[PDB]
Structure 1
Amino acid sequence: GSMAESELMHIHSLAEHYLQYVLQVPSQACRVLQRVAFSVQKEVEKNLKSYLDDFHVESIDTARIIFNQVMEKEFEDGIINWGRIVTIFAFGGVLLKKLKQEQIALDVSAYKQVSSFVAEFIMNNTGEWIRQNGGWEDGFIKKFE
């Protein structure tokens, strides 16, 4: 209730902090998440470079459309795990970097807009799973210890 609302706000903070990191905009889960999500983002940018070059992300709406279409396909089997969750943040960063390169409308707040749709997807698709699987401290961080 208030618990689901708190969960979404927490996910939003995680997403905002990750995306800020991605763009060098001025906690332990944040630190480890930033490192692993960025390692994924780098892998994607390097290995799927030609596919990423088939999109021009000229607007926030285009970013949202592509994010959702890709994520929907990724998650169509209904499988959730921390690996899957990490890839959502990563792909959000991938798209934010493209948006910053290709956006036509002046948008200095783009990472805020992207953080919102990324947080909504994470909450809507994986929010219950996260609380059922140890949360960020007793679930996600424990994967590295």
Structure 2
Amino acid sequence: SMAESELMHIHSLAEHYLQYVLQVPAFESAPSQACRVLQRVAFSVQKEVEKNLKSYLDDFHVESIDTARIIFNQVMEKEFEDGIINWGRIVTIFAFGGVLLKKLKQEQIALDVSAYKQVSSFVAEFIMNNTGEWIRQNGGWEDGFIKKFE
């Protein structure tokens, strides 16, 4: 119930970050404060990664949403192996979701509004299943996340 709502809030955050990444309409409402902070911090990471891991990223292809989900889950499983969760690492999850979605679109003639939906879903599931309780204990998105990153 709380966990259900928590998953749905993570999903909306992921959707909005990935829409931002594909330069696609909000058009319903203005981003919340947490959305804006997330877009700023997660994008700085996407940028740093794509810049400084370019050689590593070039040595594989994301031909499918199926495969994006696979590479994402294995990179993420290995990242969080030590069991350490913090706000900074949580930001890297959104960012890598973004790196792959952008990889997917550059290899597709046209991905559909559906690709970014399916990616937002697997991003959200990982964050929720791996960090959802931690987020809940550390002030959630309005206090925790925003006060951490101004």
CA contact (8 A) 1:41 1:94 kept: yes
Alignment CA distance shift 1:134-1:43 (3 Å): same
SS at match of 1:105: coil
Give the Cα separation in 2 of the matches to 1:105 and 1:29. 30
Q: What is the total number of aligned residue pairs between the two structures?
A: 144
CA contact (8 A) 2:14 2:123 kept: yes
Q: Structure 2: which 5+ runs fail to align?
A: 25-30
Cα distance between partner residues in 2 of 1:104 and 1:35: 28
Cα distance in 2 for partners of 1:106, 1:98 equals 11
1:108 & 1:135 partners in 2: Cα distance?
29
Identity percentage over the alignment? 100
Once the two structures are overlaid, the 10-residue window that deviates more, 97-106 or 114-123, is 97-106
Between the aligned partners of 1:76 and 1:105, the Cα distance in structure 2 is 35
Tell me how far 1:107 sits from its aligned partner: 3.6
Contact kept? 2:105, 2:111, Cα under 8 Å: no
Deviations 1:6-45 (A, max 9, x none): 0000000000000000001190000000000000000000
- Indicate how the Cα distance of structure 1 residues 144 and 105 shifts in structure 2: closer, same or farther if over 3 A, else same: closer
**Structure 1 runs, 4 residues or longer, greater than 3 Å off:** 103-108
Partner of 1:48: 53
Deviation at 1:104, TM superposition (A): 7.0
TM-score by length of 1: 0.95
1:105 Cα offset (Å): 8.3
Asked if the contact 1:59/1:104 (under 8 Å) is kept, the reply is no
How far residue 103 of structure 1 moved from its aligned partner, in angstroms, is: 3.5
Q: Distance in 2 between matches of 1:13 and 1:144?
A: 19
| 1:109 Cα deviation after fit | 1.7
Unaligned runs of 5+ in 1: none
The TM-score, its normalising length taken from structure 2, stands at: 0.92
